[PDB]
Amino acid sequence: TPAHIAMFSIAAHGHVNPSLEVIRELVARGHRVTYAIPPVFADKVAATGARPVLYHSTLPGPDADPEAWGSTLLDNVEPFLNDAIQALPQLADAYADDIPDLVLHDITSYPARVLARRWGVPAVSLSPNLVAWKGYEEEVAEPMWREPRQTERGRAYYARFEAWLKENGITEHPDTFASHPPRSLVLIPKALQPHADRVDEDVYTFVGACQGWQRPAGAEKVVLVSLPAFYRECVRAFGNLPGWHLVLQIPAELGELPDNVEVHDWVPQLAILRQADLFVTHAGAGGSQEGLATATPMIAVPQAVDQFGNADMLQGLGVARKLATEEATADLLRETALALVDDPEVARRLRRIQAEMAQEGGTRRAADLIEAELPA
Ligand code: NA
């Protein structure tokens, strides 16, 4: 009698954590939720109340080095196809006698898309990062693929992808299949989406609200640094700076610590950000999102190209300064920190963005929108 919603993802934190609360909420509303997942994340998934449906994925495990996921475009993308080809039959079999009413999936799951179509039920894509805007194909996708696509390997990748879709009754081009879902909930704030003005809001809905430690007395400004020489620059930057208190998430090669510095291997990030006045971050999604949700200005120290994207966005919003690790020295860190925490306009902008995020809604709204897709 309860509707059966089948969620699909892979064993990667960034492709599971962002929708965990949505899944929990759907279970709380009485829906029967199953969640296709590799065994390493069975416990994680079961904790939401959803039933794990186990399958073997050939993608790197959640603890693998980022290098394992590849350095080139083809190296990054082929694994998702290879995985999908071998995962599809496993999942088809697992669900054969219990076809769901609706398919939910993280963007990485090609099998979810295929099965939704095979089963004749709606699919809802859940994006943990930015989505395509109108013009993306000409502006980003085509230029990006222009060279690899014309190589032998590239031609054979796309040939293989087309054939696989053809074997499952799909005639959409693989680029459409992969990058252009019919319906998507975007789990990042619109503020972190490039060209958000050209995103098709009949397809995509931004639901980026941040639905997902004690400040020392005498601390007038609290700075959290989260994700060597850089940590020591931070110690020199904030150590014994009057009124400041530094929380360093990093481990005895930092040297002697001043009294206003505390170091942890792990910290409750969101809990500290609620009581923090500055956040030094690598500017991945999540970090960027929690900074905005807590109206905490940021020093963005990006390294992995997308972070350079988030960082430029944040800096474009006037709520962060982007620094290279070459610039990330004590004097510049301190100067930047003083300038950001003392700027009433930075604070005003953060309040605006925080309010916009609240309006997007998060968990409750996402669950509503998923229910609205129940062919019902
Ligand atoms: Na804050």
UniProtKB/TrEMBL annotation:
Pfam families: EryCIII-like_C. Residues 362-376 have a biased composition (Basic and acidic residues). Keywords: Transferase. Gene3D superfamilies: Glycogen Phosphorylase B (3.40.50.2000). UDP-alpha-D-glucose binds at N17, W266, V267, H282, G286, E290. SUPFAM superfamilies: UDP-Glycosyltransferase/glycogen phosphorylase. GO terms for molecular function: hexosyltransferase activity; UDP-glycosyltransferase activity. Residues 252-360 form the Erythromycin biosynthesis protein CIII-like C-terminal domain. GO terms for biological process: antibiotic biosynthetic process. Belongs to the UDP-glycosyltransferase family. This is Oleandomycin glycosyltransferase. It comes from Streptomyces antibioticus.
